[PDB]
């Protein structure tokens with residue numbers, strides 16, 4: 001849809017600021033930590049694979065979770081309930097065939113009941129005020145991909161991988177906007193696979209120069225290098241698959257431009 | 258729900274009912290859309306989640322205003338501004354006299370403005386038909402019923418196959434394309450445009466194949482020249498009868514050259530060539546557009 005492409009990008013750039021979670025919210029949570037959040041999201045990755053859900057669904061769920069936690073205190077025993085309801089809501093929004101609630105209950109091994117998950121769905125909806133149509137790193141990536149002609153599926157797989165890795169670590173990635181994370185991921189993926197750099201056409205469209213990506217790019221590069229050592233491994237396992245060109249097996253570049 | 262007086266039932270569905278109602282405290286007349294959750298073992302229906310979340314972003318003169326959402330254990334209420342009637346009821350009342358051309362042009366122009374706003378905010382409507390379009394006494398018309406709407410990606414991916422009401426359903430959907438986008442909404446508006454002009458549904462099929470053939474008999478059976486890739490569509494059959502395209506002077510008699518031009522562009526077979534809402538608004542057909550009052 002080239003006639004609206006520009007308008008849509010502009011709109012998403014406005015929305016990502018409005019749907020942005022509070023960068024330092026974890027300091028104000030009395031019981032949960034970044035490490036527990038990482039474990040939750042890693043688990044959501046597996047859930048998504050189990051039910052063959054879209055990557056977009058995963059990204060939305062994370063957005064919902066971080067926004068919910070930005071205003072609601074949650075004890076560690078209930079964090080997964082928040083996560084499950086978030087994934088359920090993201091599924092209903094994004095999927096053609098969302099799994100039924102009984103399946104979400106099953107996937108938690110009966111940690112929570114149907115009533116609990118449905119009641120949590122209501123609370124999340126109330127807290128987010130039904131504002132579910134959030135822009136994700138995923139949405140910006142797919143737009144950025146259009147600047148590759150012809151398309152490079154390996155670069156796309158790697159960009160998605162890198163973008164997904166950013167969901168795990170609130171520190172530091174909560175401080176960058178999805179559009180910016182998507183730019184660093186795209187550049188890094190392109191550079192790794194083809195040795196090329198972030199396109200002038202993308203610099204103009206997004207207003208991000210290669211230097212403006214630098215801060216996020218440095219973080220993303222480190223994350224990439226240390227990925228095999230990270231405590232959470234569900235994303236690497238996922239992207240070893242041939243459908244993703246086994247990009248998680250590719251060696252990251254030692255240094256950058 | 259204490260503060261609302263139900264005045265009459267104006268709609269009904271499998272998920273609930275639509276009432277005309279008045280706020281007992283302020284006097285405001287509203288449309289009340291009631292959605293049952295008790296018959297919902299799945300919690301809040303995805304259709305409602307999409308309708309609410311997408312409407313809240315869509316602030317435009319030609320899109321129905323969502324005023325409030327009341328969410329309880331057993332029920333979900335959507336509160337809308339109240340409009341006089343939908344375009345179907347109006348068309349039925351005008352079936353003998355006809356809708357004056359200046360009014361048809363105004364409505365199409367307004368619908369295109371609402372639709373272009375949707376598409377510019379990455380929303381597909383997917384259920385454009387006269388009964389989902391609302392008119393007031395002052396000459397305005399607005400898109401409504403976003404229950405089938407969806408936020409889309411750039412580029413798009415495969416979305417739900419079973420969407421638009423048969424009569425208004427685009428051929429790329431009928432032929433089972435893996436991908437469809439904004440062009441399906443333009444097709445629907447094209448059908449509605451012709452419907453206003455001729456006082457009857459352009460393509461009133463009674464099955465998917467019948468729907469396809471009615472389109473083919475009017476616009477001609479598509480081939481690889483008119484529509485590259487068509488013979489590779491999942492539900493295309495090389496055995497389809499080959500009909501010739503009819504002259505629009507026969508299809509939409511009352512319509513001038515510009516009208517016929519715009520209509521044909523809205524009904525282009527190839528989704529990639531089909532006119533966009535934005536471009537449609539710049540069509541010479543609208544150079545003289547006014548905002549006449551309807552006759553109720």
Ligand SMILES: Nc1ncnc2c1ncn2[C@@H]1O[C@H](COP(=O)(O)OP(=O)(O)O)[C@@H](O)[C@H]1O
Nearest residue numbers: 267268270275288337338339340343388402404
């Ligand atoms: N805001 C409104 N003002 C006036 N009538 C309305 C309004 N909303 C709905 N209606 C009437 O109720 C009918 C059904 O409403 P709609 O939103 O289309 O629900 P459904 O999803 O069941 O079709 C419409 O065809 C219209 O005639």
Ligand SMILES: [Cl-]
Nearest residue numbers: 345386387388
């Ligand atoms: Cl109708």
Ligand SMILES: [Mg+2]
Nearest residue numbers: 388389401402
């Ligand atoms: Mg309707």
Ligand SMILES: [Mg+2]
Nearest residue numbers: 402403404405
């Ligand atoms: Mg509906």
